[PDB]
């Protein structure tokens, strides 16, 4: 069976684990349990042939900066993730995640993924940001960041509602296999 290795990175609290678990199991995690290192496996049929997805969940915490690259060798595609309702997490795409991944994996495709899409239209979330003169990250703004960091694709999704979720992994697959 063809196999694809996909590694997911990005700031603490952005939704990396929920993204992977909602996609692979259709169940959205009830708890917020920060990750150290987890690997999941799932199969998909791609144009009539099965592909094994090896999905590598990593820690957003800076504590794990020396450990994290244990995941990187032989990666086929990265998902760099930020929350659409956390401008700090968005900035770190450029400041931290892109340069980290590229150092270890000079040629590996990167998808930029904006998470928590359901909160961009959430009134309380909008107000919480508006109180501080901020707004959610917009699709054109995310795309501009994707271009700046040389992502092969920019995608937005909600692990919670599953809107855009399948497409994130579809595009990750196509980024590797065509």
């Amino acid at each position: 069976m063809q196999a694809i290795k996909c590694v997911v990175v990005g700031d603490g609290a952005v939704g990396k684990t929920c993204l992977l678990i909602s996609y692979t199991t259709n169940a959205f995690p009830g708890e917020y349990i920060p990750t150290v290192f987890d690997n999941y496996s799932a199969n998909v049929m791609v144009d009539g042939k099965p592909v094994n997805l090896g999905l590598w969940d990593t820690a957003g915490q800076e504590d794990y900066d020396r450990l994290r690259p244990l995941s990187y060798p032989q990666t086929d595609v990265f998902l760099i993730c930020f929350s659409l309702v956390s401008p700090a997490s968005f900035e770190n795409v450029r400041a931290k995640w892109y340069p980290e991944v590229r150092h270890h994996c000079p040629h590996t495709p990167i998808l930029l993924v904006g998470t928590k899409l359901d909160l961009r239209d959430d009134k309380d979330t909008i107000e919480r940001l508006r109180d501080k003169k901020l707004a959610p990250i917009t699709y054109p703004q995310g795309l501009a960041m994707a271009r700046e960091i040389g992502s092969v694709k920019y995608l937005e999704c909600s692990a919670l509602t599953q809107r855009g979720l399948k497409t994130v992994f579809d595009e990750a697959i196509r980024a590797v296999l065509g």
């Binding site: 692979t24 199991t25 150290v36 999941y40 799932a42 998909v44 791609v46 997805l53 992994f169 579809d170």
Partner: peptide
């Protein structure tokens, strides 16, 4: 086209126990 995923397995779990200072 690409199908929905199947056959979920949680293959590796690494924890950290802050009291013992060790990975679980």
């Amino acid at each position: 086209e690409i199908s929905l995923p199947s056959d979920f397995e949680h293959t590796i779990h690494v924890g950290f126990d802050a009291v013992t200072g060790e990975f679980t």
